[PDB]
Write an enzyme that holds these catalytic residues in place. Structure first.
Site, mmCIF file in Angstrom:
data_model
loop_
_atom_site.group_PDB
_atom_site.id
_atom_site.type_symbol
_atom_site.label_atom_id
_atom_site.label_comp_id
_atom_site.label_asym_id
_atom_site.label_seq_id
_atom_site.Cartn_x
_atom_site.Cartn_y
_atom_site.Cartn_z
ATOM 1 N N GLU A 235 0.821 -1.216 0.000
ATOM 2 C CA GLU A 235 0.000 0.000 0.000
ATOM 3 C C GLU A 235 0.858 1.271 0.000
ATOM 4 O O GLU A 235 0.850 2.061 0.936
ATOM 5 C CB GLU A 235 -0.964 -0.002 1.181
ATOM 6 C CG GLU A 235 -1.858 -1.230 1.178
ATOM 7 C CD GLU A 235 -2.886 -1.237 2.286
ATOM 8 O OE1 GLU A 235 -2.519 -1.588 3.430
ATOM 9 O OE2 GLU A 235 -4.042 -0.894 1.997
ATOM 10 N N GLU A 340 -4.323 -9.267 -1.112
ATOM 11 C CA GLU A 340 -4.877 -9.117 0.233
ATOM 12 C C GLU A 340 -6.369 -8.825 0.129
ATOM 13 O O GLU A 340 -6.768 -8.088 -0.738
ATOM 14 C CB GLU A 340 -4.199 -7.931 0.922
ATOM 15 C CG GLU A 340 -4.467 -7.805 2.415
ATOM 16 C CD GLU A 340 -3.896 -6.489 2.926
ATOM 17 O OE1 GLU A 340 -2.639 -6.404 3.118
ATOM 18 O OE2 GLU A 340 -4.691 -5.552 3.129
ATOM 19 N N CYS A 342 -9.807 -8.212 2.962
ATOM 20 C CA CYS A 342 -10.301 -8.332 4.318
ATOM 21 C C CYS A 342 -11.671 -7.691 4.456
ATOM 22 O O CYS A 342 -12.105 -6.905 3.619
ATOM 23 C CB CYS A 342 -9.332 -7.686 5.286
ATOM 24 S SG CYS A 342 -9.245 -5.907 5.028
ATOM 25 N N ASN A 370 -13.210 -11.023 -9.026
ATOM 26 C CA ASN A 370 -11.792 -11.117 -9.259
ATOM 27 C C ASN A 370 -11.504 -12.019 -10.469
ATOM 28 O O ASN A 370 -10.771 -11.628 -11.423
ATOM 29 C CB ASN A 370 -11.144 -11.601 -7.973
ATOM 30 C CG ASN A 370 -9.714 -11.212 -7.751
ATOM 31 O OD1 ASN A 370 -9.366 -10.026 -7.702
ATOM 32 N ND2 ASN A 370 -8.895 -12.248 -7.611
HETATM 33 N N1 LIG Z 1 -4.195 -3.511 4.497
HETATM 34 C C1 LIG Z 1 -3.214 -4.134 5.420
HETATM 35 C C2 LIG Z 1 -2.704 -3.140 6.465
HETATM 36 O O1 LIG Z 1 -1.689 -3.777 7.224
HETATM 37 C C3 LIG Z 1 -3.794 -2.625 7.412
HETATM 38 N N2 LIG Z 1 -4.524 -3.701 8.094
HETATM 39 S S1 LIG Z 1 -6.099 -3.914 7.801
HETATM 40 O O2 LIG Z 1 -6.447 -5.169 8.394
HETATM 41 O O3 LIG Z 1 -6.278 -3.731 6.392
HETATM 42 C C4 LIG Z 1 -7.020 -2.643 8.637
HETATM 43 C C5 LIG Z 1 -7.669 -2.990 9.802
HETATM 44 C C6 LIG Z 1 -8.405 -2.050 10.505
HETATM 45 C C7 LIG Z 1 -8.493 -0.752 10.039
HETATM 46 C C8 LIG Z 1 -7.847 -0.400 8.874
HETATM 47 C C9 LIG Z 1 -7.121 -1.341 8.188
HETATM 48 F F1 LIG Z 1 -6.486 -0.994 7.044
#
Ligand SMILES: NC[C@H](O)CNS(=O)(=O)c1ccccc1F
Ligand SMILES: *[C@@H]1O[C@H](CO)[C@@H](O[C@@H]2O[C@H](CO)[C@@H](O)[C@H](O)[C@H]2NC(C)=O)[C@H](O)[C@H]1NC(C)=O
Ligand SMILES: *[C@@H]1O[C@H](CO)[C@@H](O[C@@H]2O[C@H](CO)[C@@H](O)[C@H](O)[C@H]2NC(C)=O)[C@H](O)[C@H]1NC(C)=O
Ligand SMILES: NC[C@@H](O)CNS(=O)(=O)c1ccccc1F
Ligand SMILES: NC[C@H](O)CNS(=O)(=O)c1ccccc1F
Ligand SMILES: *[C@@H]1O[C@H](CO)[C@@H](O)[C@H](O)[C@H]1NC(C)=O
Ligand SMILES: [K+]
Ligand SMILES: [K+]
Length: 501
Positions: A235, A340, A342, A370
């Site tokens: 990122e 990645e 989430c 995707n």
């Molecule tokens: N994209 C990976 C980076 O290490 C950030 N971790 S996360 O799990 O994406 C995340 C969690 C909670 C709030 C904001 C976030 F971005």
């Protein structure tokens, strides 16, 4: 082999409960004989990758929804599926008793589990760390003589990776990504906040940073682990943002272009690790196609970049056709890979919703999107988290397909695990997406692929409440008469006999 033990926590569906003496598992993978198909079914109502078999029929007399396989209409080859071995995932897995650790790892990496073949490995610390560190914290060490792996790698991550590899029958590919450089290479001298590498690509700061990648690969190679790919930065857009809360390193697209061309590409290619692939971006899709244009229209950077890594934040909306579609059109020979994904990241979303069918559907819908937009692989974020969605040193909690509860020596497999599994278990590396055409408008999501050995796999997702009868036609083989129940996902597999038209 062993069925799900369901438990409800008051969300729309159940989790499967595993512990030191029990986990759900499959028999060793076997295909049905010619003329038979296999169906694996998961439902909100609680079915979890249940296997049934049916006949392939020569004849079809119906006039309802028909999905016709287009086996000669070929798209991308698939690299694979997996998830991330963060410090948080490693700590949660190792907090389990050895029997439960084994059953957790088998769930993901064995043929009696869902067949992951990718592990993403952070290069030193990220937010899903409980300690902030890099591999070269001693300042002004531009030759990186004091580069070394701490116990987070040597005692936690590397041993778990080795254990995963022993359980896997599929070859596993590792992907590495850094979040921050040593602070003495950065404009702001901190692991977080707004800041970039000091100076300019091609200078000592940039050359040291590129050499850190090689030291990382060297160090992991001493532990007998080799990487398939690295990304140029996790990122890169994040480190351009005032007050960014955790480890980052900001690059504009022009900065990444010049870094790759002047420093990282040449340094990797001059190393013994020259077969490791370099992926650019490693960020959200709305940076495309702009980022791709900037980097790949420069021939000196272009000759080092093997692919484009994209992130999926499933709590958010973004266009796919204008980002992934357009990038594929403009750069069809540069693979797209999802590094990645989430869910539950927004502060106001409960991080862990045990038994959320909605989050499962978000996962499978994202994977289908995707694959329909030419992406060659899909990587989940943390392999396991605690019930808070942690640990995480900035409290950035999120969901995970497996949730560990140390107080009960138990782990819970979320619907997300099964939604991902409907793909990862049935799409071996080297599978090729093929076309799949509906006879009439319908509410289903679906994707078809061909295995390297010619066998067919179709995944069918029904996000609606309505049961949808349907027939799948394989022109070479026959008809599969089925039904897609409301709030279900199905994977269909069959052997494809040779047939001439
Ligand atoms: N994209 C990976 C980076 O290490 C950030 N971790 S996360 O799990 O994406 C995340 C969690 C909670 C709030 C904001 C976030 F971005
Ligand atoms: C692990 O979980 C299993 C499955 O829930 C537990 O086994 C169950 O225990 C209950 C209570 O005695 C029995 O009524 C069930 O028949 C058992 N089921 C099976 C499939 O064995 C087991 O006790 C748990 N193990 C540990 C170490 O806590
Ligand atoms: C390219 O890689 C080679 C690896 O052989 C590097 O060459 C060595 O550099 C070290 C110091 O960095 C010397 O101690 C060795 O004597 C060199 N070996 C040989 C065979 O000449 C080289 O420095 C790298 N070039 C870069 C990164 O620009
Ligand atoms: N009946 C078809 C319709 O529901 C759309 N589903 S799809 O074609 O599988 C699909 C296409 C693009 C992105 C995601 C998707 F799920
Ligand atoms: N076994 C791993 C292989 O690389 C691909 N697996 S498969 O063919 O999709 C499959 C078939 C039948 C039952 C389960 C399966 F996973
Ligand atoms: C299919 O249709 C034709 C008759 O038109 C014939 O081959 C057969 O009776 C039918 N059934 C099967 C199983 O092939
Ligand atoms: K060190
Ligand atoms: K949250």
């Amino acid at each position: 082999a062993r069925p799900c033990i369901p438990k409800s926590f008051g969300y729309s569906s159940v989790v499967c409960v595993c512990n030191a003496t029990y986990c759900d598992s499959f028999d060793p993978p076997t295909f049905p004989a010619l003329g038979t198909f296999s169906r694996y079914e998961s439902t909100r109502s609680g079915r979890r990758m249940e296997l049934s078999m049916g006949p392939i029929q020569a004849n079809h007399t119906g006039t309802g929804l028909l999905l016709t396989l287009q086996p000669e209409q070929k798209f991308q080859k698939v690299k694979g599926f997996g998830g991330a071995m963060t410090d948080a995932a490693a700590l949660n897995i190792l907090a389990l008793s050895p029997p439960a650790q084994n059953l957790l790892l088998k769930s993901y990496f064995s043929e009696e589990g869902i067949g992951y073949n990718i592990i993403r490995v952070p290069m030193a610390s990220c937010d899903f760390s409980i300690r902030t560190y890099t591999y070269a914290d001693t300042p002004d060490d531009f030759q990186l003589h004091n580069f070394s792996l701490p116990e987070e790698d040597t005692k936690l991550k590397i041993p778990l990776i080795h254990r995963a590899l022993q359980l896997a029958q599929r070859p596993v590919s590792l992907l590495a990504s850094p979040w921050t450089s040593p602070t003495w290479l950065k404009t702001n001298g901190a692991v977080n906040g707004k800041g970039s590498l000091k100076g300019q690509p091609g200078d000592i700061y940039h050359q040291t940073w590129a050499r850190y990648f090689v030291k990382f690969l060297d160090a992991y190679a001493e532990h007998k682990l080799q990487f398939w790919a690295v990304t140029a930065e996790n990122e890169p857009s994040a480190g351009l943002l005032s007050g960014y809360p955790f480890q980052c390193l900001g690059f504009t697209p022009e900065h990444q272009r010049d870094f790759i061309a002047r420093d990282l590409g040449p340094t990797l290619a001059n190393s013994t690790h020259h077969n490791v692939r370099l992926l650019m971006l490693d960020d959200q899709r709305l940076l495309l196609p702009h980022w791709a244009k900037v980097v790949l229209t420069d021939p000196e950077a272009a000759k080092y970049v093997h692919g484009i890594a994209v992130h999926w934040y499933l709590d958010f909306l973004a266009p796919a056709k204008a980002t992934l579609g357009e990038t594929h059109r403009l750069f069809p020979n540069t693979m797209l890979f999802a590094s990645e994904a989430c869910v539950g990241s927004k502060f106001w979303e409960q991080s862990v919703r045990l038994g959320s069918w909605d989050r499962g559907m978000q996962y499978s819908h994202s994977i289908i999107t995707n694959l329909l937009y030419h992406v060659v692989g899909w990587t989940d974020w943390n392999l396991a988290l605690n019930p808070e969605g942690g640990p995480n040193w900035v409290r950035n909690f999120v969901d995970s397909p497996i949730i560990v509860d140390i107080t009960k020596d138990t782990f819970y497999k979320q619907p997300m695990f099964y939604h991902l599994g409907h793909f990862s278990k049935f799409i071996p590396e080297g599978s090729q997406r093929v076309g799949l055409v509906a006879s009439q408008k319908n509410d289903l999501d679906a994707v078809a692929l061909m295995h390297p050995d010619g066998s067919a796999v179709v995944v069918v997702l029904n996000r609606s409440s309505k049961d949808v009868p349907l027939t799948i036609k394989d022109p070479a083989v026959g008809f599969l008469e089925t039904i897609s129940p409301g709030y279900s996902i199905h994977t269909y597999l069959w052997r494809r006999q040779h047939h001439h038209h």
